[PDB]
Amino acid sequence: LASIFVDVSSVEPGVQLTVKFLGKPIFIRRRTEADIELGRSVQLGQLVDTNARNANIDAGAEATDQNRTLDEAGEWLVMWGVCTHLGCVPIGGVSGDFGGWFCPCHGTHYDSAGRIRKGPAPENLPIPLAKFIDETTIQLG
Ligand code: FES
């Protein structure tokens, strides 16, 4: 009964919806074609953290762009908005130097798939249990 159900029917490309779950923000970004291409252009060897940190798939999965989104098309990036350093809320709308998020508390930059690229945070932003249950609704948890 913890699960919640988020209507994403009105989320347009380039919009992040932020929902509170288990007391913390979940970011649901409908990624732009630029965000998607950028994420898919990164090689695993360039990443600080090569683990997908994704509750929905094998815990040893690589942090490819494809392993960071709910959908094959790569439009739906769902992550905990909780910096893996000390838990501040990363600032989005294509912030920081890697086309993603910037955490101002101690200067962590995350890329367009929420992967850590610069700064003190050790890990990619983790991905919650999340799936579409039809065309318009993501179940979290
Ligand atoms: S809490 Fe995000 S960089 Fe320290």
Side-chain angles (χ1 to χ4, degrees), residues 2-141:
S3 308
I4 62 168
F5 302 88
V6 184
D7 182 355
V8 299
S9 65
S10 296
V11 182
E12 297 279 7
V15 174
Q16 178 182 304
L17 180 58
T18 300
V19 189
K20 188 167 175 177
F21 182 53
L22 309 180
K24 302 180 193 186
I26 287 181
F27 295 170
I28 298 165
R29 180 176 174 85
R30 191 172 179 188
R31 299 198 304 168
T32 71
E33 304 304 338
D35 293 332
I36 297 167
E37 179 182 330
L38 184 66
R40 296 192 176 176
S41 297
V42 183
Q43 296 168 1
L44 288 174
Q46 301 177 257
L47 297 174
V48 171
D49 176 12
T50 59
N51 188 283
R53 310 292 172 194
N54 185 339
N56 301 291
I57 63 180
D58 189 81
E62 300 163 335
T64 60
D65 188 84
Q66 293 86 349
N67 284 344
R68 295 285 300 169
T69 60
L70 272 47
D71 58 324
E72 292 191 327
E75 299 192 47
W76 295 102
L77 178 64
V78 179
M79 329 168 276
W80 289 105
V82 178
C83 184
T84 67
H85 178 231
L86 294 173
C88 286
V89 181
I91 306 304
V94 197
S95 290
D97 296 341
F98 296 86
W101 288 259
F102 177 70
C103 185
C105 292
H106 317 91
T108 294
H109 297 64
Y110 297 96
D111 73 15
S112 71
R115 297 170 299 202
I116 188 273
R117 308 297 295 280
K118 184 177 180 177
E123 294 178 18
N124 303 325
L125 295 173
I127 295 163
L129 283 177
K131 67 174 307 182
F132 278 88
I133 63 159
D134 53 32
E135 296 175 341
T136 57
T137 302
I138 298 172
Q139 173 182 350
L140 299 174

